[PDB]
Design an enzyme around this catalytic site. Structure first.
Site, PDB file in Angstrom:
ATOM      1  CD  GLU A  38      -0.526   1.116   3.454  1.00  0.00           C
ATOM      2  OE1 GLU A  38      -0.397   2.283   3.120  1.00  0.00           O
ATOM      3  OE2 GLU A  38      -1.039   0.759   4.502  1.00  0.00           O
TER       4      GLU A  38
ATOM      5  CG  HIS B  57      -8.991   4.380   5.020  1.00  0.00           C
ATOM      6  ND1 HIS B  57      -7.802   3.697   4.816  1.00  0.00           N
ATOM      7  CD2 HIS B  57      -8.881   4.961   6.259  1.00  0.00           C
ATOM      8  CE1 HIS B  57      -7.035   3.883   5.908  1.00  0.00           C
ATOM      9  NE2 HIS B  57      -7.646   4.646   6.818  1.00  0.00           N
TER      10      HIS B  57
END
Length: 110
Positions: free
Chosen positions: A73, A102
């Site tokens: 990520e 998110h």
């Protein structure tokens, strides 16, 4: 002053330099310089910096992968103020999935 911190921009720097930007220090890294996870003073203790290079075990599960595999990520979009909810997810197979909520949404880009 001028860096790359976007979905397509970071995806390019990824398949380009095959490595997050030199300004992508994980969160623990920001804590090393003195950062409170409160997420309300990150750029205050480590301005001109981004959070990326963290393992993505898929706290939810929305990326093209399976058990045993691991994703990556990176922080997407970041200037000043509380952290944001935009982040990208690159895999070992160069699978790039951007999320603007998110890890709540993922789009296959590069």
């Amino acid at each position: 002053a001028q860096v790359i911190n976007t979905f397509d921009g970071v995806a390019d720097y990824l398949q380009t330099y095959h490595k997050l930007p030199d300004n992508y220090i994980t969160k623990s890294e920001a804590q090393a310089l003195g950062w409170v996870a409160s997420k309300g003073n990150l750029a205050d203790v480590a301005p001109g910096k981004s959070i990326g290079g963290d393992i993505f075990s898929n706290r939810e599960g929305k990326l093209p992968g399976k058990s045993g595999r691991t994703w990556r990520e990176a922080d997407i979009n970041y200037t000043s103020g509380f952290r944001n909810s935009d982040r990208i997810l690159y895999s070992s197979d160069w699978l790039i999935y951007k999320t603007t909520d998110h890890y709540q949404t993922f789009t296959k880009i590069r």
